[PDB]
Design a protein around this nucleic acid. Structure first.
Ligand SMILES: Nc1nc2c(ncn2[C@@H]2O[C@H](COP(=O)(O)OP(=O)(O)OP(=O)(O)O)C[C@H]2O)c(=O)[nH]1
Ligand SMILES: [Ca+2]
Ligand SMILES: [Ca+2]
Length: 1203
RNA sequence: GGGUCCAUC
RNA sequence: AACGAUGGACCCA
């Protein structure tokens, strides 16, 4: 020991101060029980003195109302855990009561009346408690709402009853309005705001009263939103609170809402790197299949878990070997991931969301203090989250020179433990110190070894997935002539062997059957094992007897249920979730392994509203059974959006939309807007007029107008719209205009490759004299290409990227384009392509067959603009299959040149930058890919690659003429690698051009033929391009001036100047809606109209059937309704707290799919996968359904918010 | 992913 | 009867 202190428990059994603040203030009181008590009193304020050195951004809010007088209280602390703590409740419940009767309002007044009790309950807790700010409200008939400790509100009404103020209090808590009336806002806070914004807009170049009226209508909205009056009522958002009051002859005298920790900052805590630095000072001085075990540290702010995780890392490293911010360490036998539990709600969230499943907690308590009040709450979190085991580390024992005392604290913890139904008598308790273990001290050092030994020993090994009873969530069901019925999915757990009997359980009466077989794409199989994608064949059962959503389990293993208790987390706005609260009758979709299912919920007693971000518990009853174990995770969904995650707790026992409306809308949708003349042109012209420009004299001027590249941005913007707007209209009368043009272009590119092909195979200028930029970039580019690409397309590469995709082939018309049809119907293939097919056919047991063997593709024509079509070519099915393989690998390799062909947004932003700085150029080639000759590829690519390109292309073309071409270009548009090959060729040359000029290659950025490099490089790029057989399009290439374009964004001195196109004769209401919405999005700034354009919009909105004039959707939801305000939409039905708007959809009819083909396509897909708050992964990917568009329109109801 | 629709290369 | 690619919305689930 050190001193004579064996019954200090009496000194602590009334102070809860500590075994080293009791054993200590007792050696300076010579042993006087009632004497020490006082030495600690007046000394307990000096600990609370350095206490205020800890940011305390958690706590509670409280509210009290004297039938007519109300008060709202805010009392802070450091963590969730103390805020739920019984003692912290009593202090602030008193400071609340004793602020109601003694009506206080002066904050620092109620503070000092509660300072000596504040140090009595701050020495006992160990956290900076501090009554932050109080306030109070008085009114005629006032009311309050509170959810949990986090948000409290006081509302003052007049002419309102009990419910009304309750509801308005709830709304105030959900929508936090800064003001009661729009008219309240500082009549000069907005004055400066309208004066700053008025210029911002005047800058675009828009005339006084344009920026004026926009800024006005803007700010009219800005205010209504931050104001009770002009906020859509939370319990029926179709009307505002403003309107809600007026129907009850009521008014709000005012309101107050505090939120715990508002305005604090609370510096973020990164635990994972926390230990890195903690270990920093100390950093100086097959068996890849170990079980992974999840542990977490939990305890008082800094009893030392702070440092103990460090100590575990060092000491475990020093001795043995070496997601979401987690330390991890190793044991001779196991692997551990370790998380800190800094907060109760923070943790419960991660446990539901599945971001932190704990196999065992380690509860850290420093013996210097012993257990604390809030340690009750730490063990309680463990109880509530169901952590199976808790191990205890007694920390800071170096500062306890009396072992008799350790046994005292160890005994307390053993008792709190048992109070919460944990095995307190039998739980491992290590007595040690991390303080002196990370700093090398063999004594306290092996104590960490002792604890680790208990992670290995006491926390049992987590059951391996392969060890659990078999289960496969069913994704799809297939009838296969001769084979029988087969289900596909990923085996979730266990093994299934052929012959074994299986149960199929879920949506309908559970059935049984027997596993005939197991197969993948390549092999056929004896068993399917956990984590494997397979199809499983069944005996007897029919395809119509099975359903996606069911599972396939070892019989009896799992049962179907409909009702259950869960822990769910509702996502916040900032997490892509709901942005509005729900209430009693929430009715969403519950997504289980692989399917959505409907269900109603019941909230617990005393909760009436859930807001985004909430950790609600709820009882969910489903519309029909589905197989569920205990601890099954699900997603909460609203029409495809995930708005919540949940896990099932205890499985229980079990026990409006508009049809004429939809009909009215459908008849409306299938009507034809009927007008005299060219309606598109009338619209374009009325718009030109409303902006003060001359209209289009004739159909001919629509396609032959040139913009001026000067003027204010405002004037260029409309001027450029005029130039572009009608430029792709497919329905002009006057024009000897045909696809004859496309074919001439197409013939012209070929002739051009003929020349370049001749010229480029003759790199001999009759002598070793003359040097050229062209020859030089090719040599330079070649060498770079070879380093990026290899000598040849890897095997892995091909097997990772070949696949079928999409539309027509030489053998299939568009209506048979689905991949499953490419596997069913036999595909054509090229003589040189044949060996690829054979190698494919050698890799599976499935039938891979060839309709024909032939060197032709089909040159056809597609729409492009008012002056010309585009000739493309339809490939042979199997050549495609292989063309996408190389296309996919070039796509990967290009990432190393910082070229990212999945993201056109890089080119858009660099085009924007370019128009501001003039340092970047946007370049365009005249017939990009048709001009890429065989000769150019041959001396740019490794031989290996060139050969494979030559196998895979189609060498000849059959034109609609009946006539032929033998391809001079390397490949036509339609070929599955043309786009990635042109991207490569273009980048390589441009990059080489950068070098030859001492520019940085990384300034080169390419998407197809959309090229961006530094402006300086352009004249040289132009020359290299000329040399290799390209023609740069001067008209669409910009190395100077205010203007840039890349990937469909157009900028002028930095302003978005992108236009919209009217492409077709407008004839259906959906046509007109498209046009009106495109006008909307072009002339609207954040919902606010440019008035010049609004006048045109309103005039043509009148041509729609009336109901369609008012059927509005928000932006971001397609074009089956007009974009506008969904809160005004008379057709919007709210069902179970979710909004549904009806939209026009193309009316379809179901078709029959090819069963063997669809099966094949499924398996082939799963083969592809294998070889290549964060819970988007609770979902799958879907079956194959075929359909045909009739030409009619349907009306579909869809969920939408305002996100 | 596949379709439909919207931008695009 | 219209090819290949990207991103978005709905729908497929
Ligand atoms: N298969 C296919 N490829 C396309 C299509 N549009 C563009 N591309 C690819 O993007 C590049 C060309 O874009 P565009 O600029 O519109 O066509 P272009 O052939 O170069 O002719 P131009 O500049 O004169 O209009 C090359 C081409 O492979 C298309 O509709 N289908
Ligand atoms: Ca081009
Ligand atoms: Ca371009």
């Amino acid at each position: 020991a050190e001193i004579t202190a064996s019954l200090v428990k009496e000194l602590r059994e009334r102070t809860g101060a500590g075994m080293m603040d009791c054993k200590k203030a007792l050696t300076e009181a010579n042993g006087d029980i009632e004497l020490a008590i006082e030495n600690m009193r007046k000394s307990g304020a000096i600990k609370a003195a350095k206490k205020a050195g800890n940011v305390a951004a958690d706590g509670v809010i409280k509210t009290k109302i004297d039938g007519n007088y109300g008060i709202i209280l805010e009392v802070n602390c450091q963590t969730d855990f103390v805020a739920k703590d019984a003692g912290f409740q009593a202090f602030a419940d008193k400071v609340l009561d004793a602020a109601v009767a003694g009506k206080i309002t002066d904050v620092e007044v109620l503070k000092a009346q509660f300072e000596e009790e504040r140090v009595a309950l701050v020495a006992k807790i160990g956290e900076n408690i501090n009554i932050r700010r109080v306030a109070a409200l008085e009114g005629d008939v006032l009311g309050s709402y509170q959810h949990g400790a986090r948000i409290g509100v006081l509302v003052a009404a007049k002419g309102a009853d009990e419910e009304l103020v309750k509801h308005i209090a709830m709304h105030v808590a959900a929508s936090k309005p800064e003001f009661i009336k729009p008219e309240d806002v500082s009549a000069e806070v907005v004055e400066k705001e309208y004066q700053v914004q008025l210029d911002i807009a005047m800058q675009s170049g828009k005339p006084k009263e344009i920026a004026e009226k926009m800024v006005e209508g803007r700010m009219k909205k800005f205010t209504g939103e931050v104001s009770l009056t002009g906020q859509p009522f939370v319990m029926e958002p179709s009307k505002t609170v403003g309107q809600l009051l007026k129907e009850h002859n009521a008014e709000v005298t005012g309101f107050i809402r505090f939120e715990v920790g508002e305005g604090i900052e609370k510096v973020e805590t990164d635990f994972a790197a926390e230990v890195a630095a903690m270990s920093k000072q100390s950093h100086m001085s097959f068996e890849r299949t170990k079980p992974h075990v999840n542990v977490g540290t939990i305890g008082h702010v800094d009893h030392g878990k702070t440092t103990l995780t460090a100590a575990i890392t060092t000491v475990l490293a020093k001795t043995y070997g070496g997601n979401t911010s987690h330390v991890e360490y190793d044991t001779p036998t196991r692997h551990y991931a370790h998380v800190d539990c800094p907060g109760h709600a923070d943790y419960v969230k991660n446990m539901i969301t599945g971001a932190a499943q704990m196999d065992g907690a380690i509860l850290v308590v420093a013996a210097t203090d012993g257990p604390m009040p809030q340690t009750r709450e730490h063990i309680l979190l463990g109880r509530q989250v169901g952590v199976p085991y808790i191990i205890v580390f007694l920390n800071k024992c170096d500062m306890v020179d009396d072992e008799e005392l350790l046994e005292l604290v160890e005994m307390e913890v053993r008792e709190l433990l048992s109070q919460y139904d944990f095995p307190g008598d039998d739980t491992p308790i290590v007595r040690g110190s991390a303080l002196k273990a990370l700093e090398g001290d063999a004594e306290w050092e092996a104590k960490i070894l002792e604890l680790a030994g208990f992670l290995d020993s006491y926390i049992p090994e987590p059951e391996r997935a392969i060890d659990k009873p078999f289960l496969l969530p069913i994704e799809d069901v297939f009838s296969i002539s001769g084979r029988g019925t087969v289900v596909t999915g990923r085996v979730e757990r266990g093994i299934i062997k052929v012959g074994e009997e299986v149960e199929i359980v879920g949506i309908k009466e559970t059935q049984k059957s027997t596993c005939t077989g197991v197969e993948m794409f390549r092999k056929l199989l004896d068993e399917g094992r956990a984590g494997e994608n397979v199809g499983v064949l069944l005996r007897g059962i029919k395809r119509e007897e099975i359903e996606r959503g069911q599972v396939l389990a070892k019989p009896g293993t799992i049962k179907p249920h409909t009702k259950f208790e869960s822990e769910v987390y509702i996502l916040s706005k900032d997490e892509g979730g709901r942005h509005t609260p729900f209430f009693k009758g929430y009715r969403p979709q519950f997504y289980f392994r692989t399917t959505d299912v409907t269900g109603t919920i019941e909230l617990p007693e005393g909760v009436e509203m859930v807001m985004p971000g909430d950790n609600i518990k709820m009882v969910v009853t489903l519309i029909h059974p589905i197989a569920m174990d205990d601890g099954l995770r699900f997603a909460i969904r609203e029409g495809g959006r995930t708005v919540g995650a949940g896990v099932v707790a205890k499985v229980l026992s079990g026990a409006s939309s508009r049809n004429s409306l939809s009909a009215q809308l459908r008849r409306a949708a299938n009507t034809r807007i009927e007008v005299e003349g060219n309606l598109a042109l009338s619209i374009a012209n009325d718009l030109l007029l409303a902006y003060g420009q001359s209209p289009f004299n004739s159909e001919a001027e629509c396609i032959s107008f040139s913009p001026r590249f000067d003027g204010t941005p405002d004037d260029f913007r409309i001027n450029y719209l005029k130039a572009e707007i009608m430029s792709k209209y497919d329905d002009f009368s006057l024009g000897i205009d045909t696809e004859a043009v496309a074919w001439e272009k197409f013939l012209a590119a070929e002739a051009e490759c003929a020349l370049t092909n001749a010229r480029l195979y003759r790199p001999d200028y009759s002598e070793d004299f003359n040097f050229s930029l062209g020859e030089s970039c090719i040599h330079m580019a070649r060498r770079k290409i070879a380093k990026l690409i290899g000598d040849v397309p890897s095997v892995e590469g091909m097997l990772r990227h070949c696949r079928f995709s999409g539309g027509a082939t030489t053998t299939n018309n568009r209506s048979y384009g689905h991949p499953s049809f490419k596997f069913a119907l036999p595909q054509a293939c090229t003589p040189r392509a044949l060996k690829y097919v054979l190698a494919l056919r050698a890799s599976t047991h499935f039938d891979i067959r060839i309709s024909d063997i032939s060197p032709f593709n089909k040159a056809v024509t597609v729409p492009k603009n008012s002056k010309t079509d585009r000739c493309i070519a339809i490939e042979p099915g199997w050549n495609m299959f292989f063309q996408l393989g190389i296309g996919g690998i070039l796509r990967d390799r290009l990432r190393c040149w910082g070229i990212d062909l999945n993201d056109q947004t890089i080119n858009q932003r660099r085009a924007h930058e370019g128009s501001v700085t003039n340092n970047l150029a946007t370049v365009d080639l005249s017939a990009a890919s048709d001009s890429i000759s065989l000769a150019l590829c041959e001396l740019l690519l490794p031989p290996g690659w060139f050969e494979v390109l030559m196998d895979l292309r189609s060498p000849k073309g059959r034109l609609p003429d009946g006539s032929v071409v033998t391809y001079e270009k390397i490949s036509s548009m339609g070929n599955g690698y043309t786009f990635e090959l042109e991207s490569l060729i273009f980048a390589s040359l441009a990059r080489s051009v950068c070098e030859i000029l001492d520019l940085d290659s990384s300034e080169v950025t390419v998407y197809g033929d959309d090229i961006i490099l530094p402006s300086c490089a352009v004249p040289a790029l132009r020359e290299v391009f000329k040399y290799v057989g390209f023609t740069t399009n001067t008209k669409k290439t910009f190395s100077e001036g205010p203007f840039r374009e890349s990937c469909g964004k157009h900028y002028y001195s930095g302003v978005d100047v992108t236009p919209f196109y009217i492409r077709h004769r407008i004839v259906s209401p959906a046509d007109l809606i498209l046009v009106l919405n495109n006008l909307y999005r072009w002339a609207t700034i954040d919902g606010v109209w440019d008035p010049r354009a609004h006048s045109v919009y309103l005039k043509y909105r009148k041509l729609l059937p009336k109901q369609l004039q008012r059927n509005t959707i928000p932006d971001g939801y397609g074009d089956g309704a007009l974009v506008g305000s969904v809160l005004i939409n008379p057709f919007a039905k709210n069902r179970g707290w979710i909004r549904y708007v009806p939209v026009i959809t193309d009316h379809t009819r179901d078709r029959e799919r090819a069963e063997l083909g669809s099966y094949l396509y499924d398996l082939f897909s799963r083969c592809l996968s294998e070889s290549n708050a964060i819970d988007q992964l609770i979902c799958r990917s879907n079956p194959t359904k075929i359909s045909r568009s009739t030409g009619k329109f349907d009306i579909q109801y869809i969920a939408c918010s305002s996100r």
